[PDB]
C-alpha cells in the first residue's frame, strides 16, 4: 500500500511540476526512472529542480498564508547531504544568517534528508529556530508561555535559561540512532532583535518590549510527490499583527495590553471605552515603526492583503484554482478593512504542501 501511495503521489507531482517548468515531454522517461527506483529501493530521489519547485508549490498551496504572492522567489537550500549533528547545526546557523541578510529578509527554506520508512533522519524540536523561553513556577510567569513545554524539555537536557522575559532557546534536534537530542546555544551575533518604540509616545520604551527579526518555522513537514521532508525549516518576514496583535497581546502570550494602555495614557477600566482596541492599534503602530526604523523587513496587514489580492488575480490568470483558509487569512485587527473578509475561500488541501506533525516532547 505504501509504495502505491508513493507512486501515485509521484505521478501527480512530476506531471504538474514538469508542466509548469515547460518540461512536459520529459515526464514519461522520468516517471519510468522513478518507478524502477521505487521498485528497487522503496523510494525515489528528487532532482534539484524538482525539490526547488516542489517547495515553491508547497508554499503556493498553503491555505493559511497571506504572503503567497511571492511563492516563486523562495530561496531553496538543498541540504540532503548532511549526515552529522555538526553539519545540521551549521546548516541551521547558516539559514539564520542568509535569511536575515542584515535585515533585508530573504524568504528561505533549508531542506534536510527526508524520512525513509517513516524513520526520521533529523528531528528538529524547536517550533521556530529563534524563539523565547517560557517559565511557570509557583504563580510566577516569565517569558513566553507558548514555549513552556519545550523550555522544560531543554532544561532536562542540561540547558539552563537565565529567566529573563526574552531568553533565546538553544537549537535542539535529534539524529537518527541517537536516544536524546543535542542542544546548541544561538550565537547572539546571528540573531537580530528589534526594541519596540512608538513614533510619538516617548514613554512606550518604558515597557522594555522587543521581538526577534526573523520567524523561522522549523517543526512542519514538507511533502513533495510522496516524499516526506519532516525537517525543512522555512521563513518569510513578519506581518506586523503577528507580533503586535498576538505574540505581545494574547492573554496566554506576553499579555501586554493593560501595560500598553497605561503608557499611552488611557484608562483600562470600561469595555465601552474600547481601551483594548486602542491599545492594540498603538502597539501595532509601534511594532511597524520599530522594525522599519531598524531596517528589518516587515509588512503591515493592509499592504499584505493587497499583495494577496494580486496572488488571487495571478492564480486565476494562470488557470490555477485558489485555495485558502478564511479564518487564518483575515488579520486579527480591522479584518473587515481588507478584501479578504468580504469573500470566501475553498479550504481544500492540495499537495505539495506543509503539514503539522506530532511533537517529540509533550
Ligand X SMILES: CNCCN(c1cc(F)cc(CCc2cc(C)cc(N)n2)c1)C1CC1
**CB-nearer residue toward ligand HEM: 184 or 355:** 355
Candidate list 342, 349, 356, 362; residue touching ligand H4B; CB under 6 A? 342
328 binds ligand H4B (CB under 6 A): yes
Which residue in the list 242, 253, 326, 328 is annotated as catalytic? Answer: 242
* E strand or H helix at 108: strand 108-111
Cα–Cα–Cα angle for 338, 323, 24, rounded to 5 degrees: 130
245 binds a copy of itself (CB under 8 A): yes
Nearest residue to ligand H4B by CB is 328
Cα–Cα–Cα angle for 218, 344, 251, rounded to 5 degrees: 50
Give CA separation, 347 vs 56, 325, 331, in Å: 19, 5, 17
Chain centroid to CA 226: 22
Per-residue burial over 172-210, b = 16 or more CB atoms within 10 Å of its CB, e = otherwise = bbbbeeeeebbbbebeeebbbebebbbeebeebeebebe
CB of 29 to Cl ion, least distance (A): 44
DSSP state of 253: T
Which residue in the list 65, 71, 123, 131 is annotated as catalytic? Answer: 65
| Cβ atoms of residues 303 and 60 within 8 Å | no
Candidate list 227, 280, 329, 340; residue touching a copy of itself; CB under 8 A? 280
**CB-nearer residue toward ligand H4B: 272 or 344:** 344
On the 0-12 / 13-18 / 19+ scale of CB atoms within 10 A, 114 is: buried
3 binds ligand H4B (CB under 6 A): no
Cis peptide before 352 (omega within 30 of 0): yes
| Catalytic site includes residue 59 | no
Which residues 6+ apart lie within 8 Å of 162 measured at CB?
none
Output the DSSP codes for 18-69. Answer: HHHTT-GGGHHHHHHHHHHHHHHHSS----HHHHHHHHHHHHHT-TT-TTGG
10 binds a copy of itself (CB under 8 A): no
CA distance 211 to 187: 17
345 binds ligand H4B (CB under 6 A): no
The annotation status of 17 as a binding-site residue, yes or no, is no
- Among positions 288-327, residues that touch a copy of itself (CB under 8 A) are 288-289, 292, 300, 302-303, 306, 326-327
117 binds ligand H4B (CB under 6 A): no
| Catalytic site includes residue 68 | yes
Binding segment for Cl ion (CB under 5 A), chosen from 30-38, 156-164, 185-193, 208-216, is 208-216
92 binds, among ligand X, a copy of itself, Cl ion, none (CB under 5 to 8 A by kind): none
Candidate list 112, 135, 237, 275; residue touching ligand HEM; CB under 6 A? 237
132 binds ligand HEM (CB under 6 A): no
54 binds, among ligand X, ligand HEM, a copy of itself, none (CB under 5 to 8 A by kind): none
| Catalytic site includes residue 328 | no
Contact footprint for ligand H4B (CB under 6 A): 327-328, 341-344
Contact footprint for ligand HEM (CB under 6 A): 59, 62, 64-67, 70, 74, 107, 109, 234, 236-237, 239, 242, 299, 304, 328, 354
**Which residues make up each annotated binding site for heme?**
65
Amino acid at each position: 500500500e505504501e509504495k502505491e501511495i508513493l507512486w501515485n503521489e509521484a505521478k501527480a507531482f512530476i506531471a504538474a511540476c514538469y508542466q509548469e517548468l515547460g518540461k512536459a515531454a520529459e515526464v514519461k522517461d522520468r516517471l519510468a526512472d522513478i518507478k524502477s527506483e521505487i521498485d528497487l529501493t522503496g523510494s525515489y530521489v528528487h532532482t534539484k529542480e524538482e525539490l526547488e519547485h516542489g517547495a515553491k508549490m508547497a508554499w503556493r498551496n498553503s491555505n493559511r498564508c497571506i504572503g503567497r504572492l511571492f511563492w516563486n522567489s523562495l530561496n531553496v537550500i538543498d541540504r540532503r547531504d548532511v549526515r552529522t549533528k555538526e553539519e545540521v547545526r551549521d546548516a541551521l546557523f547558516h539559514h539564520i544568517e542568509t535569511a536575515t541578510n542584515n535585515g533585508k529578509i530573504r524568504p528561505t527554506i533549508t531542506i534536510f534528508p527526508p524520512e525513509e520508512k517513516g524513520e526520521k533522519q533529523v528531528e528538529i524540536w524547536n517550533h521556530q529556530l529563534i524563539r523565547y523561553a517560557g517559565y511557570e513556577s509557583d504563580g510566577e510567569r516569565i517569558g513566553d508561555p507558548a514555549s513552556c513545554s519545550l523550555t522544560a524539555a531543554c532544561e532536562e537536557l542540561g540547558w539552563r535559561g537565565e529567566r529573563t522575559d526574552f531568553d533565546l532557546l538553544p537549537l535542539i534536534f535529534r539524529m537518527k540512532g541517537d536516544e536524546q537530542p543535542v542542544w546548541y546555544e544561538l550565537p547572539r551575533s546571528l540573531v537580530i532583535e528589534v526594541p519596540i518604540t512608538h513614533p510619538d509616545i516617548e514613554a512606550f520604551s518604558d515597557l522594555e518590549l522587543k521581538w526577534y527579526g526573523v520567524p523561522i518555522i522549523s517543526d512542519m513537514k514538507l511533502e513533495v510527490g510522496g516524499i516526506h521532508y519532516n525537517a525543512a525549516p522555512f521563513n518569510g518576514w513578519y506581518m506586523g499583527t503577528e507580533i503586535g496583535a498576538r505574540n505581545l497581546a494574547d492573554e496566554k502570550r506576553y499579555d501586554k495590553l493593560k501595560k500598553v494602555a497605561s503608557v499611552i495614557g488611557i484608562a483600562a477600566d470600561y469595555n465601552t471605552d474600547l481601551w483594548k482596541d486602542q491599545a492594540l492599534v498603538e502597539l501595532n503602530k509601534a511594532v511597524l515603526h520599530s522594525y522599519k526604523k531598524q531596517g528589518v523587513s516587515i509588512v503591515d496587514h493592509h499592504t499584505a492583503a493587497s499583495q494577496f489580492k494580486r496572488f488571487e488575480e495571478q492564480a486565476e490568470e494562470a488557470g490555477r484554482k485558489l485555495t485558502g483558509d478564511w479564518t487564518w487569512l483575515i488579520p486579527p485587527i480591522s479584518p473587515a478593512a481588507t478584501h479578504i473578509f468580504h469573500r470566501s475561500y475553498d479550504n481544500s488541501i492540495v499537495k505539495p504542501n506543509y503539514f503539522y506533525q506530532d511533537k517529540p516532547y509533550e
